[PDB]
Amino acid sequence: MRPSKMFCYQCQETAKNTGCTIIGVCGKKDNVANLQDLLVYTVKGLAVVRENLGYSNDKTDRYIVDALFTTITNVNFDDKDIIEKIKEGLALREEAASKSTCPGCGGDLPDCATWTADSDDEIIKKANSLEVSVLATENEDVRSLRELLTYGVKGIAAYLHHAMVLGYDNKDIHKFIRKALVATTDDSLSADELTALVLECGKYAVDTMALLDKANTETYGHPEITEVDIGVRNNPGILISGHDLKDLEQLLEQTKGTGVDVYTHSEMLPAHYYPAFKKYDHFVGNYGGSWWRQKEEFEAFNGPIVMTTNCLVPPAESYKDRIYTTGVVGFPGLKRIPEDENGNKDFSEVIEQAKKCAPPKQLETGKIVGGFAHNQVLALADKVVEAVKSGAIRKFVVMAGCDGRHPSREYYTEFAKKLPNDTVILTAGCAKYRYNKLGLGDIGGIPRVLDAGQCNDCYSLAVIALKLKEVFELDDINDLPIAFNVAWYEQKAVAVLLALLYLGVKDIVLGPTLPAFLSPNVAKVLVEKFGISGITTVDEDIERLINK
Ligand code: SF4
Ligand code: SF3
Ligand SMILES: [Mg+2]
Ligand SMILES: [Mg+2]
Ligand SMILES: [Mg+2]
Ligand SMILES: [Mg+2]
Predict the structure, then answer these.
(1) Do you find a cis peptide bond into 512, omega within 30 degrees of 0?
(2) What CATH number is given for 367-547 in this structure?
(3) From 7, 28, 494, mutation site for ligand 1 pocket: most ligand atoms within 8 A of C-beta
(4) In CATH, what number does 226-356 get?
(5) How far apart are CA 238 and CA 240, in angstroms?
């Protein structure tokens, strides 16, 4: 028997920073949480069986990343959809096991690789079992390392999903995903071995973000400096949220000539920086702020909303009838975008509904400038280097990552406002919405907020830093005039963090709280070896990061 109805602590908003045990703060109900645990368990067992075979295939690789992504915060609240994904994984595992060359020989397999269920009732019973819970790992430090690795792997999986959607892949990354999953089932490993896998997860996070950067830029062009409207026009619109640029491509193609405009929301803002989307005159602008304001902003938008990935919050009744899910997203009673076997999506029902809607309510007017991904910044490298050498830019501050609901995140807005006028903020991810409309101006034409894009575009921030390290002939990335004051919420941010640690970045400030899934001993290593610190007060952190 489980000791509580559920247990989940994977996001920054976990109850009391110790764990959601009755209902998720995010709205994930206990039955859904337990089914997500079973989906992860099923994926681990599939990984075991494929690793025993010695090879995988494309359908298994895609299933694994999609199943992991299904369990990221604010992606899927639909117990029925999670049950079908569990059944799909069991079928793939049973198919794989039927191909074994040594039926019986391999040492006793873990229960995740052999459990079965022939009805939804039996699936639900297994989901409610102790063995699938996070707390099944009894030692606190092993549990912390296993969960930290798992959440990093979920972040990798999400980015790899998007690359695969675009026709890109890297089987070495999938191999690592399977290795890491299997490691969490292996009681022979020491904490040092798990620590090494966490660092390796950072290595593969860099490789995955490199692959997604390649996929997005080869498909849609390199981001370029762009002014994005944050006001509204006078036509019915469709609002697209999340991160999938291929969904946007198809939505724009299908809305051309219809009288329905398209707007972006939250992590779709960076689509406006890509040449392939800038070409459409009905692509109006970015509506609203980050994900956590969506109940009010989706209502005010009046038109339909298409959610391509996280973050989805349980919808208000006012717009439930006009919000659609695609990809791995799910919520009971929300309509899906129809999709064929080749990944082509049909937005016809959305467009017909949009034509009947009022235009969006104006929330604000003005522009956001962005598009400073790696190609664009490297094209300005002489100007950037000259400003560093003259002291016109004294420090860069990476404030990338995720936004969220906690009012403690007012810290990030006030930190940005208190930064001296010779500093530049480098950003990516929806954390940007705490400071991207502040009107901070420019330094010799270089804006004081440089938005490289989506959270995956932290890759560009790394590429930029490594280019500056080479230009200045420095042996250590940390010798650059760069500070890190990163905000996190969901598991892609864990992958980004691990990527930065693998790249050698020290003294990161991580906030607005530190994860619940770090045990005291694991947190101590992060502090002592990597210099990780939580936020304090704006004034104290400006002093320690900028003025000392
Ligand atoms: S995803 Fe976050 S808020 Fe939701 S149940 Fe897990 S820890 Fe709680
Ligand atoms: Fe891609 S950054 Fe992480 S929190 Fe939900 S959309 Fe935001
Ligand atoms: Mg061993
Ligand atoms: Mg190539
Ligand atoms: Mg309404
Ligand atoms: Mg329906």
Answers:
(1) yes
(2) 3.40.50.2030
(3) 28
(4) 3.40.50.2030
(5) 7
H helical segments located in 184-312:
191-220, 245-255, 275-278, 294-301
Helical H segments across 290-331, by residue range: 294-301
Cα(240)–Cα(255) distance, integer angstroms:
12
Per the CB < 8 A criterion, the answer to whether 168 and 211 are in contact is yes
Domain 367-547 in the same topology as domain 226-356? yes
Paired sense of beta strands 423-427 and 449-451, if any: parallel
CB of residue 28 inside a 6 A radius of ligand 1: yes
Cα 465 to Cα 476: distance, rounded to the nearest angstrom: 11
What are the distances in angstroms from CA 281 to CA 224, 250, 277, 349?
Answer: 17, 15, 9, 22
For residue 238, the 8-state DSSP code is E
Residue 73 CA: nearest ligand 1 atom is 1
Q: Give me 253's structure tokens.
A: 């193609």
Taking each helix axis from N to C end, the angle separating 30-53 and 79-97, rounded to the nearest 10 degrees, works out to: 20
**Using what technique was this structure determined?**
X-ray
Rounded Cα distance, 277 and 247, in Å:
12
What are residue 324's phi and psi, to 5 degrees? -120, 145
Which H, E and C letters describe 523-539, residue by residue?
HHHHHHHHCCECCCCHH
Report how far apart, in Å, the C-alpha atoms of 521 and of each of 143, 515, 536 are: 12, 13, 21
User: Of ligand 1's atoms, which has the minimum distance to the CA of residue 15?
Assistant: 8
Contact between 290 and 261 (Cβ < 8 Å): no
Print the SS3 string covering 201-214: HHHHHHHHHHHHHH
Q: What resolution does the deposited structure have, in angstroms?
A: 1.5
Coil, strand, or helix at residue 181?
A: helix
What type of residue is 187? Answer: D
Residue with CA at minimum distance from ligand 2 atom 1: 455
CA-closest residue to ligand 2 atom 5: 311
Q: What is the DSSP letter of 435?
A: T
Separation of CA 213 and ligand 4 centre (Å): 12
